[PDB]
Amino acid sequence: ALMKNPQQDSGLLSNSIDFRDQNLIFSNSGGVCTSSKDKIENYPAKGYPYKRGVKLSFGDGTTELEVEAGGGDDLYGVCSDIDEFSGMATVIPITNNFTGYLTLKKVNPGDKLNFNQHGELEKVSVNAIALSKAHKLTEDLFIVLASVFGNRA
């Protein structure tokens, strides 16, 4: 439904002839532009925070801290990838900038976007600048290219 790699198989082989508009898929993990000096941290995943802003969640104390989808003043980083076998989400901290496709609330280049309570970007604290218009992948799934530059009022 919302997983990075679809569980349903594909009936037919794809046609690998064109090279344009073949990257606006939900399986595109990471960022469009990535440097070798980027800091990334794996954390236990609570729910499915892939391609969403994450916040730190603390339990009773028996188990370690984890990350869950969210935003606002509690925003801690951006989830760029997930490993389902280990349930481990790769998070880029808010202290580090990121450029890539992120989930948008169900928007033109230059708009100011902030994370909501569900970890989805929405038009306006400003957290990112939209680099493209919303691209629809499902009836409720809308992605957008955004550039995150931390926290600023």
Partner 1 sequence: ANPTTIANEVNTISTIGFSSEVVRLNYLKLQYKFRHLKQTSEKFYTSDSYIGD
Q: Is there a contact between 139 and 87 (Cβ–Cβ < 8 Å)?
A: no
Choice between 74 and 81, CB closer to partner 1: 81
CB of 57 to partner 1, least distance (A): 16
Task: Report the site for partner 1 in 77-96 (rule: CB under 8 A).
Answer: 81-83, 85-86, 88, 90
CB of 42 to partner 1, least distance (A): 5
Cα separation, 36 vs 40, whole angstroms? 11
Choice between 41 and 140, CB closer to partner 1: 41
Distances (CA, A) of 31 to 18, 82, 108, 151: 22, 13, 20, 20
Q: Quickly count: other Cβ atoms within 10 Å of residue 7's Cβ.
A: 6
Residue of 139, 140, 132, 138 lying closest to 21 (CA atoms)? 132
Cα separation, 46 vs 39, whole angstroms? 21
Choice between 65 and 137, CB closer to partner 1: 65
Site string for partner 1, 22-61 (x = CB under 8 A): ----------------xxxxx-------------------
Binding site for partner 1 (CB under 8 A): 38-42, 64, 81-83, 85-86, 88, 90
